[PDB]
Amino acid sequence: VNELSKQPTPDKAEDNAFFPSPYSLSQYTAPKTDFDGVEHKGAYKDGKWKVLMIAAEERYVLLENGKMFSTGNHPVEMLLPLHHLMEAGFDVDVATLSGYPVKLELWAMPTEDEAVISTYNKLKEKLKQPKKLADVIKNELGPDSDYLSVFIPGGHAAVVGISESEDVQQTLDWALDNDRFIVTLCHGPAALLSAGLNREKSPLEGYSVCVFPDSLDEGANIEIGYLPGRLKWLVADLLTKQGLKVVNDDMTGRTLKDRKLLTGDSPLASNELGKLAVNEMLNAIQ
Amino acid sequence: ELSKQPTPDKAEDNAFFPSPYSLSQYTAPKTDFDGVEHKGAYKDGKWKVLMIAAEERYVLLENGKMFSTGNHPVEMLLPLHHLMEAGFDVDVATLSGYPVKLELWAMPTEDEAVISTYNKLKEKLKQPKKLADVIKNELGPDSDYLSVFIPGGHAAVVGISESEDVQQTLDWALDNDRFIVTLCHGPAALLSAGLNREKSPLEGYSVCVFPDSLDEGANIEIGYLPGRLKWLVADLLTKQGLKVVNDDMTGRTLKDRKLLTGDSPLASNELGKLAVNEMLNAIQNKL
């Protein structure tokens, strides 16, 4: 079990595209999460407030050497926080930039965790046929929106399309203008780069965030064959050049609240970000 | 005996490639390509082809399973070989600028024409233009695009069939006398001309389309599809008032004004020939 290959495994559906190495899956994934119970089982009861998830619809990330990383949204990052929220009484709607199926990193699916798998099963229909984010902006936002918060889970695929979208931009500008939560972790914060699009100054300038660290993406992830190549830019770097305070440089499961921007650093931070989100959302219903 | 069971796709939940049996029947290491007919015929470097390619690989089916598909690589690459050899360059667009999803299991590995065309286009297939950027900067009456090309594969059914960007692209071609060239499930893209309108501008147009009877029947029984399509292309186009000209798959092609179609992967080679001749003839008409 320390003889497992360090080489990335090819994805036969795609040209020159690679899953993470069998060794890296041993160090970074697990059949069970650190989850041990929800705090606020049924606290909210009016059935009005909802979470809006913007998820990833493109699985493949083009790298510097021309190879592609077969990724997706990380499923623990998506599904653990959502177990907390749904159990607290907050229903969930899923959107992608085009209405395409949601792409997960199914190689990180913790197959033995009941809470995550049943969460995945309650969400399957919405993941396979999401709403179109432009349809959401047009009809379901504005000042009387029933959406209390926007959730952007991570995984490497969040780096693509979501980081340079005017539809994501408009969605962030609503949540600031209506005092709504933006919840995000991992690479999820690349979504935030969309706020500064076609603009001299991002309206998130001076916000503080947890971000997956540069040094891991450029070093350790590349040497254990998790990524088969180098990213062409890095999320923590470009968030800084837009005037955000990247409050961490390590991967400790750290979480952070700054006004209504709640963030997590990595997959390790999933279970806690779920608690933070539930807590801060029940705190704003008064 | 090859199995008629769909083969799982590791990358996606409850998703399947076609069954080994269906592959042994519907795919081949070689195409019937037997040469282009107008090598070097167009020599100004002005006119080009705008290809609109599929960027989603998974089709959700009536039974909850997903078909792992993409654009058909023969329907794509063979017509582009003809056009490129004739002297027309090609630019690739998708609806978001995501990479092009091909049905890599249909890739004829032994065919020099198709592999060659693929390797030239690799760069552009992996980083396409975004169709709306194209709409904003590269259409109008002085566009260097002489045709739009939409290839089939079952993936054309997704997005492209309900897109405002594809709709404006088709309006542009009608209004500036450009070719629309499509085949197989690709004509599903033409349903976009009818978005938010009582009457599609493509009403009364006659087309070749992959037949309803094969998708509902044979494709299911040999495990090419792992379940039924929720809607059928010939059926929806007929409902928008296009005339669907074929009920079978035989490699039939049709020209109706500047809309050139073929019925299936069988038509690929004759459609490239047909596009090239039509475009060369249109260039000779303007002098």
Numbering used by the authors:
A (entry chain B): 5 to 290
B (entry chain A): 7 to 293
Reported in the publication:
The structural studies herein confirmed SAV0551 from S. aureus Mu50 as a member of the DJ-1 superfamily and that it has all the pertinent traits of this group, including the sandwich fold and nucleophilic arm.
The asymmetric unit contains eight molecules and each of them consists of two domains: a core domain whose similarity to DJ-1 superfamily proteins had been expected and a cap domain, which is also called the ‘P’ region. Additionally, four short α-helices (α1 (residues 26–32), α3 (residues 110–112), α10 (residues 218–222), and α11 (residues 224–227)) and two β-strands (β2 (residues 64–66) and β3 (residues 72–74)) form the cap domain. Cys190 and His191 from the core domain and Asp221 from cap domain constitute a catalytic triad. The Cys190 Sγ interacts with the His191 Nδ1, while the Asp221 carboxylate hydrogen bonds with His191 Nε2. SAV0551 has a deep acidic canyon that winds from the dimeric interface to each side of the subunit, and bowl structure is located on the bottom side.
